[PDB]
């Protein structure tokens, strides 16, 4: 069973690549290294002892994607490729819509052309906007998205649903990730974006090891216990295993939706505290204005994935922080 | 004042081109002739005595669109280019999403690059799905779209809104057209799609003049007085004038939404009857199954456009049918 992983050098992909390779799947990566290093795929190979067939380029490049499908016999696709920062998306809507919508459209056109009809799409808790209920289930209504990133994910989910209307032999799996954090236990692979990290924990990790000065906490006036945002942090290794569970267990046509989270919500300040516990020292932080597009609180009821896929995310916030710091300590400038 | 009209050779565009040129605007067309003839632009020039600067190609072709903006000083863009059949869209979602979303994205990227920040977008009553209330106003909630065409229009409206969030110096005008019908009074220009017409009235016109055999009426079990679909038919010349009214009256930043309709709803059978009155003979029709994606009834309250733009569509269903038949009689195979 051969899996094409778009955005295959990124944070969640490389963890997923490991878990697929350890289960005996063959993995192919396409990535443009906009937010990742090719060295990450060398580290996947080192950890697993297994190859990742590497393609370098853009998923919007039809000729490149044609080559990928012509040269390989692909069973499944996991589509991670995308731009993913809520705040940046508000400032750069056309960059987000172009990259995110058109990568998906070029991919689907090539998949259809080759009769490859099994996809896992990397969706997001942001599709729920301001959550109609907490904890969020797969029955919680979607919409009211607050930012072009989240909007783009909901748009893509609808595109994919309409592919299955038009050709119900597809298997579409919409995985709504909450907030993945942490690093492979080896410390040889972890989160390493380009530029200043946009997500909270890679930033916090870098402040903890002295590579950045101060955690910027975006807003303390949300309707939450301490006023900072609340999120369902999930260990990236657990999230990676969730993808393997889909491919192990779903071998029929249909549209399948899962929330992938822990059901444990932590505030920004609580995250910092977990890191301070892992580091054994204070981690400087400052209260800053709200970041556009952020909502107050979102966390998952992941019952459905446990029943249907046999999967549960049980690594803890301390496992997340410790594994993150292990990676960052051993690799302070990343790859 | 120079107006770029994408899809500039199509049905509504060519009527609009006339009305702009008669008011002293300069017009530039980009079209790929997927659903139109270049001869239509010759007929615009003949009627007006004025030139249309013609570009042949795809709005998704960034190099072509760069040439258009580099070679011309554009004030306004009217973005008509799109695929527009509700039923076809259900069968061909990726064709629709690619053409419709990516044309809009390439256009916006080039417009931003050249600081051209005034757009009229061709939107649709389909964005309201099954209407929450009748008649529909601009306060009627959008969503619940039933088909990828309508979905694509609502998606594009959101993209455009997010452009204005990111750069509020834009002028975004979202015109939700109802159902345009008819032809310029000269009979030298009218609706001439490629292949079998997808819209009701060009099909009916062709049956009336003996070029098609039988009107296919899609469904007679809707919750309407006679069971067939009900729509707000608007004369294409009135609709064209509505575009000129926008450009004449809006010269400030912001997002402006208008429903463009008559407020008069007619069933499919009523449309056929108007054509039979115009033709002086029965026009054969058969009841067929529902077309996927169609809803029962939609018609507009266009108060807001009358107040804000000074515009009202008062040509009647008989004006529509007569002008259509005048065109089709004089041009039975179109252009
Ligand atoms: N908190 C999270 O990290 C989170 C939560 C929900 C969903 N997601 C989604 O999961 C996916 C992966 O997230 P991640 O944290 O691993 O981010 P990431 O930035 O590390 O991974 C994405 C990868 O895609 C690549 N890429 C982006 N656009 C591309 C294109 N057009 N062609 C080829 N390569 C492209 C990037 O270079 C990067 O390696 C994204 O779609 C993201 O929106 C992430
Ligand atoms: N009832 C209606 O006709 C109606 C109602 C609401 C909205 N609209 C919208 O108004 C617009 C015009 O409708 P119309 O009836 O004139 O249809 P049309 O098919 O006659 O006009 C559209 C034109 O766009 C061109 N085109 C399409 N994709 C293109 C691309 N990628 N690059 C360049 N050219 C392209 C076609 O060749 C055609 O000439 C469409 O966006 C449509 O969705 C139509
Ligand atoms: O540098 C940062 C990045 C994020 N956050 C906050 O931390 C949480 C998680 O944000 P992130 O960008 O990691 O993920 P998101 O929840 O937007 O997908 C949110 O409440 C953000 O407001 C923060 O305070 N500082
Ligand atoms: O050949 C046709 C085309 C359309 N219709 C019906 O006529 C109305 C207008 O359809 P059209 O495709 O012209 O426009 P739409 O309302 O979908 O934008 C709808 O109720 C359709 O079900 C029909 O019965 N026969
Ligand atoms: Mg091939
Ligand atoms: Mg230029």
Author numbering:
A (entry chain A), B (entry chain A): 2 to 336
The publication says:
Since the recombinant bGalE protein contains one NAD+ molecule per monomer as a noncovalently bound prosthetic group, we prepared ternary complex form crystals with UDP, UDP-Glc, or UDP-GlcNAc by cocrystallization and determined their crystal structures at 1.8–2.0 Å resolution. The three ternary complex structures have virtually the same main chain structures because the root mean square deviation (RMSD) values for the Cα atoms (no distance cutoff) between them are less than 0.18 Å. The electron density of the NAD+ molecule bound in the N domain was clearly observed in all three complex structures. Figure 3B shows the mFo-DFc omit map of NAD+ in the UDP complex. In bGalE, the nicotinamide ribose moiety interacts with Phe101, Lys154, and Tyr150, the pyrophosphate moiety interacts with Phe12, Ile13, and Lys85, and the adenosine base moiety interacts with Asn33, Asp59, Val60, and Asn100. A loop region (Asp32–Ser37, magenta in Fig. 4A) forms several direct hydrogen bonds with the base, ribose, and phosphate groups of the adenosine moiety. In bGalE, the UDP moiety is recognized by stacking and hydrophobic interactions by Tyr291 and Leu201, hydrogen bonds by Asp295 and Asn180, and salt bridges by Arg292 and Arg232. These interactions are identically present in the UDP complex (data not shown).
GalE catalyzes NAD+-dependent oxidoreductive interconversion of gluco- and galacto-hexoses (C4-epimerization) linked to UDP and generally plays a key role in the metabolism of galactose in various organisms. Group 1 enzymes are further divided into two subfamilies (1a and 1b) due to their separation in the phylogenetic tree. bGalE catalyzes epimerization reactions of UDP-Gal into UDP-Glc and UDP-GalNAc into UDP-GlcNAc with the same level of activity and is categorized into group 215. The dimer interface consists of a bundle of 4 α-helices and contains 8 hydrogen bonds and 4 salt bridges. bGalE has a typical fold of SDR superfamily. The overall monomer protein structure can be roughly divided into an N-terminal NAD+ binding domain (N domain, residues 1–177 and 236–262) and a C-terminal UDP-sugar binding domain (C domain, residues 178–235 and 263–340).
